Amino acid sequence: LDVIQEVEYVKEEAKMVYLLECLQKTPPPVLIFAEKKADVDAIHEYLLLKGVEAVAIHGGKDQEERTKAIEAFREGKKDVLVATDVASKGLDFPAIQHVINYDMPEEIENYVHRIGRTGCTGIATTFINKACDESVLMDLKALLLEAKQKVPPVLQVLHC
């Protein structure tokens, strides 16, 4: 409820580059969420290739890896944790300065929970595009407005 939500239209083929730029709105720590394992893996490899202290958690990591990352992050030894929703559930995270939603969830319920991982202020960035159904976009729109947040142009048309 008390986070600055920054929702932005980003073509699928442009997110990786934009993500790098995003990391800079904020000092660490940063949590990047994506629905799929493949994605979490891509983003982590990209961040590494660009030189970001980045760790990743998902259902396909073994116990060694999960533990090592959940805790380097939790100590501040790593700036960025990239996670799936399901892998991050119940983890004890520190004060997160910035949530980056690389995906828009299908349910608005889930958008909230993700952005609910920063606050108590902080920034939530959410990449939206063509693939989102109208319904979630309306609920995102409805939410930004109730939250008294910037509505990006692409949503400002939804209902004029």
Residue numbers in the entry: 406 to 525, 529 to 568
Q: What did the published study say regarding this structure?
A:
DExD/H-box RNA helicases, from virus and bacteria to eukaryotes, play important roles in processes including ribosome biogenesis, RNA processing and folding, ribonucleoprotein (RNP) remodeling, RNA nuclear export, the regulation of RNA translation and transcription, and nonsense-mediated RNA decay. DExD/H-box proteins often contain accessory regulatory domains and localization modules, but their cores consist of two RecA-like domains joined by a short flexible linker. The N-terminal domain is commonly referred to as conserved domain-1, or DEAD-domain, and the C-terminal domain as conserved domain-2, or helicase domain. Both domains contribute to the binding site for RNA substrates and both contribute to ATP hydrolysis. We used X-ray crystallography to determine the structures of the DEAD-domains of DDX2A, DDX2B, DDX5, DDX10, DDX18, DDX20, DDX47, DDX52, and DDX53, as well as the helicase domains of DDX25 and DDX41.
DDX41 (Abstrakt) post-transcriptionally regulates the expression levels of the insc protein that is essential for control of cell polarity and spindle orientation. The two helicase domains have a sequence identity of 23% and their structures superimpose with an r.m.s.d. of 3 Å. The helicase domain contributes to nucleotide coordination via motifs V and VI. A superposition of DDX19 with the DDX25 and DDX41 helicase domains shows that in the latter two structures part of motif VI is not visible in the electron density, indicating its flexibility. The conserved motifs IV and VI superpose well, whereas motif V shows different conformations in all three structures. In the free helicase domain structures motif V, an important RNA backbone interaction site is in a binding incompetent conformation.
